Structure formats: structure tokens, C-alpha cells
């Protein structure tokens, strides 16, 4: 057994982490006080769920997580919420004033004065791990803390934990659920200094989660609560292999090995289905073929893009519920003969499939309905580069006029670090075109 440390940075990171550990508990049958009846080994054990939870002599199963925010408002909810008893005060780090959606403020100004503290709190979790695998870092692209402080934490983690893997869960900025305007700057800044330090990054576009909540769950104007309970389902399905018995994606290394043939292109697209409104009378349960065929509609992609006009480099199918291999192969065959699935000539045209029998767990009173089977497809397509193009274009519209640059310079950043980051992105967009276009 090998442990995995989760880190949550910024507002988005902390709330999404809250929605995830709430879900993990409902899946592993762990109650709000940390007790687990089905766990028969008290105070210890090397089970699969122990990769995310440690155990105390009293029987409490405590997450291996560290929440970090430069202002205490969002983390205070965690300190007084339903699952307050899980964590201890060490795991919750709060500053006094945030980074004002300013990358320079979260990286240089405020970050410099709290980094050594965060590391010490992470070292305290690492010392408990007999064989630490790596870290899972949740944050946002637009937030001054999620962007500015994450890139610094990553640079230092690559120094104190060299051989450890680092996976990202990044929130792509979407105007519908944002009141800020400088988010393109932060996103392109944080991706520039983090690229070499992240082994695999899953980007969720709020715009996508938004329309999935309005279209499938009939939410007219969704809250962050709605957006997070859904994003926690995807994350739960992407990490279930690490927490449950299995053989596919059993440690963080197998993510890069399975999904990232080229290092810089470590951004897999995620697709999930079904997503059914609980308020619904009663839905016709979709079969394996139907839910699998849905994994190729742009409607249930975490980032809106067109894979048909890109090339795949890898492809994982994670199933949860009543699913058997026979039905998986049948669906797969029928889809190749109807879809546009162009693989890169230097990669095998195939699919790695995992099946966990336990069906998706749903939050009581949440928006999602209980289904008998569900799937999550991770696919590395050059089509996700559309995302960067959108973002890189906005960056160009503002930077051409040097708008808002003073706020960043004023925190100690140099104006050259913009163009340097921007030219890095242009190189990333170029690597995506070299790999998928003819």
C-alpha cells in the first residue's frame, strides 16, 4: 500500500475538496465523525482506502489532505461544516487577506511568507506515509491563490519530493460563473511555471459543468454547490482505482504511463455519463452501449471542444456499477464503425478498461440520481488545444494594450514574465498542432 496526499489551494480548490471528501466518505462508508464500521483493522492496516485515509488508535479515519487559502472565509466553512470532525486544525491553513485575483500577489508577495509553513504541514503528512506516491493538487486557474500560490507550491514540491508524481485538477475560467476579468493572465501565468512540475492535469471548464447542470439537471442558475457536487463525481471516478481494489491505475505513476506519452501534453480530456436529474419522475436505465456511446458527445465533456478534428494518444474507460467486459467490447465495436476516432500513428489504437462493481454513490439530497451503471472516459486528444487557443487569444487582446499589467508589476513581477509565459503557450499550441494536424 502507498499513500496519496491531497492538497487544496484557493477558494475553488477548498470547496471542490470539500465536495470530494464528502463523496469519498459516503463511498467508503465513513461517517462524519471519522468512524468506519466495515473497517475491522483498528488503528492501522494497508487497505486500498488507506491510500487516502490514515487511522488513529481511536478508530478515526482522517483524510490525507491539506487545505490552503490566503483568506480564512472559505476554509472556515470547513472548520464548522458537517465534516469538521474529520480534519484537525493543522490541515487547514488560512491567511488574512487573499491575492485579489492577482497571480503576482499569490506567487511572490503573499506566497513567499507562507510557503515554508505549508511545506511543514505537508511534511507532517508525508512523515506518516510509509511509501508516499505523490500529491493531488486541486485549484483554480483564475484565482490569485489558485494560480499564483499553486505554481510556487509545485516548484518547491519538485524539490522536497523529487521522485513523487503530481496530478492537477484545474478549473478552467468561465465567465458565466466569474466576476473577474484578469483570469486569462493568471491562467497563462500559472500554466507556464507549472507545466514542467505537473505529471498529469485534468482541466474542468466551469462553462461545461455549468451547461451540464442547466441541461441535464434543469438548474436555471446553478450555484457553486451544484457545480462542485458534479465535479466531485468525476474526480471520485478518476481516483476510485487508487482507493478500491483493482489493477488499472493502481498508483499515480500509471496515470502518466497510461495517458501521457509526451510530457508537455499531459492534459487529458474527461467525459462522464450518465448525468440524470434526481427530481426526475423515473429514468430509463441506460445500458453499457448507450452510456459508452455518450462518451463521444461534446455535451458531457469537462471541456467543450471537438475531438473528431483531433487525434487521440490514449484512452481509458473507467466503469462503475453493473458492467461486464462482454458488454464493453460490444459497445466499443459498434462505436468505431460510426465515429471519427483518429489515433496518432505512433500509438496503438486501443482502450484500457477498468470496471469497479460498486455503482456511483450519490449525495443524499443532492442533484444527481442513483444509476445502475456509469462510465468516465479519459482521452488525450489534440482537440483540447482549442481550450488554450481560446485562453491565449484573450491574453493577447489585453496584453497588446498592457491592460492590468501594473497590478502585477506592482507586486514585484517583471513585465517580461508575461511574454515569456505567452511564448511558452505558443510553443504548447504548436506541439498540439504538430501531433494532430496533417
Amino acid at each position: 500500500m502507498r499513500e496519496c496526499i491531497s492538497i487544496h489551494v484557493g477558494q475553488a480548490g477548498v470547496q471542490i475538496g470539500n465536495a470530494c471528501w464528502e463523496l469519498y466518505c459516503l463511498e467508503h462508508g465513513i461517517q462524519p465523525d471519522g468512524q468506519m464500521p466495515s473497517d475491522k483493522t483498528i488503528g492501522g492496516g494497508d487497505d486500498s482506502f488507506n491510500t487516502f485515509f490514515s487511522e488513529t488508535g481511536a478508530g478515526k479515519h482522517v483524510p490525507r489532505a491539506v487545505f490552503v487559502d490566503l483568506e480564512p472565509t472559505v476554509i472556515d466553512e470547513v472548520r464548522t461544516g458537517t465534516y469538521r470532525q474529520l480534519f484537525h486544525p493543522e490541515q487547514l491553513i488560512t491567511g488574512k487577506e487573499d491575492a485579489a485575483n492577482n497571480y503576482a500577489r499569490g506567487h511572490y508577495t503573499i506566497g513567499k511568507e507562507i510557503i515554508d509553513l505549508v511545506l511543514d504541514r505537508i511534511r507532517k503528512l508525508a512523515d506518516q506515509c510509509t511509501g508516499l506516491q505523490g500529491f493531488l493538487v486541486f485549484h483554480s486557474f483564475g484565482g490569485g491563490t489558485g494560480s499564483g500560490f499553486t505554481s510556487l507550491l509545485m516548484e518547491r514540491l519538485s524539490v522536497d519530493y523529487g521522485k513523487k508524481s503530481k496530478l492537477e485538477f484545474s478549473i478552467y475560467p468561465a465567465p458565466q460563473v466569474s466576476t473577474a476579468v484578469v483570469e486569462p493572465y493568471n491562467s497563462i501565468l500559472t500554466t507556464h511555471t507549472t507545466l514542467e512540475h505537473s505529471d498529469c492535469a485534468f482541466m474542468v471548464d466551469n462553462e461545461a459543468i455549468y451547461d451540464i447542470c442547466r441541461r441535464n439537471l434543469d438548474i436555471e442558475r446553478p450555484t457553486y454547490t451544484n457545480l462542485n457536487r458534479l465535479i466531485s463525481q468525476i474526480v471520485s471516478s478518476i481516483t476510485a482505482s487508487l482507493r478500491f481494489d483493482g489493477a488499472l491505475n493502481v498508483d499515480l505513476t500509471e496515470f502518466q504511463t497510461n495517458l501521457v506519452p509526451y510530457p508537455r501534453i499531459h492534459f487529458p480530456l474527461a467525459t462522464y455519463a450518465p448525468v440524470i436529474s434526481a427530481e426526475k419522475a423515473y429514468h430509463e436505465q441506460l445500458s453499457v452501449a448507450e452510456i459508452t456511446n455518450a462518451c463521444f458527445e461534446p455535451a458531457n465533456q469537462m471541456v467543450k471542444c471537438d475531438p473528431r478534428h483531433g487525434k487521440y494518444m490514449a484512452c481509458c474507460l473507467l466503469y462503475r456499477g453493473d458492467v461486464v467486459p462482454k458488454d464493453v467490447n460490444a459497445a466499443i465495436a459498434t462505436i468505431k464503425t460510426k465515429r471519427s476516432i483518429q489515433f496518432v500513428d505512433w500509438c496503438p489504437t486501443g482502450f484500457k478498461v477498468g470496471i469497479n462493481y460498486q455503482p456511483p454513490t450519490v449525495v443524499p439530497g443532492g442533484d444527481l440520481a442513483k444509476v445502475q451503471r456509469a462510465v468516465c472516459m479519459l482521452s488525450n486528444t489534440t482537440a483540447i488545444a482549442e481550450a488554450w487557443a481560446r485562453l491565449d487569444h484573450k491574453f493577447d487582446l489585453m496584453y497588446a494594450k498592457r491592460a492590468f499589467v501594473h497590478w502585477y508589476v506592482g507586486e514585484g513581477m517583471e513585465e517580461g514574465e508575461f511574454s515569456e509565459a505567452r511564448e511558452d503557450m505558443a510553443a504548447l499550441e504548436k506541439d498540439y498542432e504538430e501531433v494532430g494536424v496533417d
Partner: protein, 425 residues
């Protein structure tokens, strides 16, 4: 705990700040003696932002009353909510400023500035975490303009990384005390350009035309004009004073609104603006259409004469947020020729479930528009009209100023006009 320090200076500064503390005090359920009597917890959520918590659950506004003559501040103390302010926070002289910027900034005001800062410092030291300052004042007089800017110049020196937002009343010849107001105004503008982060520009003429033309008041008064500023000041602070999916402090608010350091002058607006047909329910379309109407704005500037850099809108009341998004997206997509196309998503919206006193729903408008150059152009025209003959300068040279400093203030704002011009094309 993100506390704000309020400063009001001079006759206009205090009468506006006065009513302001009167309007938000009612919204937060604080009576004229400092006792809470509301029915909702949302009133106390962000209450420590503008109020200090004293003994016995008493809430004392965190405001500093400043003036060079005792008249106005006596009025506030005997006013309706006068007993709520801290007796120590009254810092006033006796000579007066004589509607002279020089006296407020160099001679008279200078003799009282240290003592005013001693109170500012006393309030800040108790702030668990200070967000920043806000000043109410006029620019055409002597105290709020002369000493007001003097205070800002000294607050940026002692608090260099704190936000300084101001509500500044600009002088118009139509609502004029003295002929030297363009002098006092031009001088204060350079200080705000240099040391303030956000300056809400309020033109008395616009306030007048709104009371006379729209509200249908045959003979308006500074009191009528201050009602509009009270309701507006309440609006642009609803974000800070009440909860919601916003969650932002002064520095974060300015980051998403000021793309260039010296161009931090906004045009506020309010809606509805109805004359006494006042009980008619107002729809979300009507609310939005007026909010963008120039006649609903208080800078006496036509927005269609310039372009918008950024726009913030705060909606108050129990309405359909789905219907708010639809309507806001409608105004943008119906007049996208007056927004700059090089700042994506430069129009944001926030909702607040608590409406102002006596309104089902309302909107508050914050426009960072290049059209504001028309304001500084009028002021510069009226300034040169007199400085070219050296008219009325003796009031200032007699207080120690030189013609050179005036010539500089002249060029300082002409630059401010050239800056606003290169971005309108």
C-alpha cells in the same frame, strides 16, 4: 474581518457622509443610538466592515468627521443619527477654509492634519485586517478639496498598500458656491490621479438635472442632491456589506475594474428614478434599460460619447437571476459599439437579496468609461478661462502658492484628457 475606515471632510463631505451613515444604518438595523433591531442575520454578517463593536452590543460607525469650521459638524452631532458617531472622531478647526484649496491643503488644513491622522491611526490599529479607506468630500470648496486631498497624500504615505476610494463631488457652474471652484477642482484632481485607487465622480449638475427633469422637483436642494448620493453610496457598497457568491475585498474589486493606474474615475448610476406612479412594480427589463440610460447617471457625461473599459452592476431584491443574466447580456449584445473589444467579459453582475428601504428591487451602476474625459474637459475649460487672466489668483498666492504650481495643475489634467483620448479610438 476586512474593515473599512470612513473619512468625510468639509461641508459637502460631511453632509453626504452623514446621510450615507443614515442610509446604511437603517439597512443594517442600527438605530440612532447604536443598537441593533433588525430581523435578519444578513444585517450583521459583514457588519464589522463599517461599524466597530463597542460594549453592550453597541455598533459605532468607523468614520472620522473632519472640517475646518465647527458649523457643519455641529449639525451632524445634533442631527438624526448624530449621537451614533464616536465623540472623539470629531476633528475640526475654527478658522475655516474660505472655499480655498490653498488654505485646506497648505496653511489652515496643515495645522490640523496631524491630529486627524492620529485618529485614523487609532481606528486602523484596532482593525483585525484593514481593507482600505474611503473619503467623501467635494472638490470645489476649500476643506474637502484642499485638506481632503492633503489627507489622502498623507494616508498613502503611512498606508502605501491600502486601497483609497473616494466619492468626489465635481463642481458645475449651474450649482456653484464660488467662482474659484474650477481652481479647487483642478488641483484636487491631480492628487486623486496620483494617490487614489477609485474615485466615483459625481457632478452636481447631473444630480440637479435628475431632481429637476426626472424626479420633477421644482426647486431642488443640496439635501435632495445628497439623497441620490446616499442611495448610490449604499449601492456600490452592497457588495461589501452583504454576503453572496461575490466574496471580494476592496483590492480584488479594484483589480477587475482599473486596467490602467491613472484611469480610475468611475461614473455611478442608480435605478429606478421615479417621481411621486411610484408604487408601480418595476420589471427586470425596465431596471436594466434605465441603468444604462445616461440620464440615470451622475457624471453629466454622455456614455455614447466615449467607450466603456469595465462595468459593474449590482442588483438588489428578490428577482429571477436567470432573468438578470438574460437582460444584461441583452444590453451588451445590443450596444457592443460602446464597449472596448480588447477586454473580454468587461461587464459583471452581482445579485443581492436585500433591497433598499422601500423598493422591491433596484440597480446600481459603476462605469469605468472614457466618456468621463468630458468632465475634466469642462473643468479645464473653466480653469483656463480664468487662469489666462490670472483672475482670483490673489486668494491663493496670498496663502503661499505660485503661478507655476497652477500652470502645472493645468498641464497635469490636460495629460489626463490625452490619456482618456488614446483609449477611445
Amino acid at each position: 474581518m476586512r474593515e473599512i475606515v470612513h473619512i468625510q471632510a468639509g461641508q459637502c463631505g460631511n453632509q453626504i457622509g452623514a446621510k450615507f451613515w443614515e442610509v446604511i444604518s437603517d439597512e443594517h438595523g442600527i438605530d440612532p443610538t447604536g443598537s441593533y433591531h433588525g430581523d435578519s442575520d444578513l444585517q450583521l454578517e459583514r457588519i464589522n466592515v463599517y461599524y466597530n463593536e463597542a460594549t453592550g452590543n453597541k455598533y459605532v460607525p468607523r468614520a472620522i468627521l473632519v472640517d475646518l469650521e465647527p458649523g457643519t459638524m455641529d449639525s451632524v452631532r445634533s442631527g438624526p443619527f448624530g449621537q451614533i458617531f464616536r465623540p472623539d472622531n470629531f476633528v475640526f478647526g475654527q478658522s475655516g477654509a474660505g472655499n480655498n484649496w490653498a488654505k485646506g491643503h497648505y496653511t489652515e488644513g496643515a495645522e490640523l492634519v496631524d491630529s486627524v491622522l492620529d485618529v485614523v491611526r487609532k481606528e486602523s490599529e484596532s482593525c483585525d485586517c484593514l481593507q482600505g479607506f474611503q473619503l467623501t468630500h467635494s472638490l470645489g470648496g476649500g476643506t474637502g478639496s484642499g485638506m481632503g486631498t492633503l489627507l489622502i497624500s498623507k494616508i498613502r504615505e503611512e498606508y502605501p498598500d491600502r486601497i483609497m476610494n473616494t466619492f468626489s463631488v465635481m463642481p458645475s457652474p449651474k450649482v456653484s458656491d464660488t467662482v474659484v471652484e474650477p481652481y479647487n477642482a483642478t488641483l484636487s484632481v491631480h492628487q486623486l490621479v496620483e494617490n487614489t485607487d477609485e474615485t466615483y465622480c459625481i457632478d452636481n449638475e447631473a444630480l440637479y438635472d435628475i431632481c429637476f427633469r426626472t424626479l420633477k422637483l421644482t426647486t431642488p436642494t443640496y439635501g435632495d442632491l445628497n439623497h441620490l448620493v446616499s442611495a448610490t453610496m449604499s449601492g456600490v457598497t452592497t457588495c461589501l456589506r452583504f454576503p453572496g457568491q461575490l466574496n471580494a475585498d476592496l483590492r480584488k474589486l479594484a483589480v477587475n475594474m482599473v486596467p490602467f493606474p491613472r484611469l480610475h474615475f468611475f461614473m455611478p448610476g442608480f435605478a429606478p428614478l421615479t417621481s411621486r406612479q411610484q408604487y408601480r412594480a418595476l420589471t427586470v427589463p425596465e431596471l436594466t434599460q434605465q441603468m444604462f440610460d445616461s440620464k440615470n447617471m451622475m457624471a453629466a457625461c454622455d456614455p455614447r460619447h466615449g467607450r466603456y473599459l469595465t462595468v459593474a452592476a449590482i442588483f438588489r431584491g428578490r428577482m429571477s437571476m436567470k432573468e438578470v443574466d438574460e437582460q444584461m447580456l441583452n444590453v451588451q449584445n445590443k450596444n457592443s459599439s460602446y464597449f472596448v473589444e480588447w477586454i473580454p467579459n468587461n461587464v459583471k453582475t452581482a445579485v443581492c437579496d436585500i433591497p433598499p428601504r422601500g423598493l422591491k428591487m433596484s440597480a446600481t451602476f459603476i462605469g469605468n468609461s472614457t466618456a468621463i474625459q468630458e468632465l475634466f474637459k469642462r473643468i479645464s475649460e473653466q480653469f483656463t478661462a480664468m487662469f489666462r487672466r490670472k483672475a482670483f489668483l490673489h486668494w491663493y498666492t496670498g496663502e503661499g502658492m505660485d503661478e507655476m504650481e497652477f500652470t502645472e495643475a493645468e498641464s497635469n489634467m490636460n495629460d489626463l484628457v490625452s490619456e482618456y483620448q488614446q483609449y477611445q479610438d
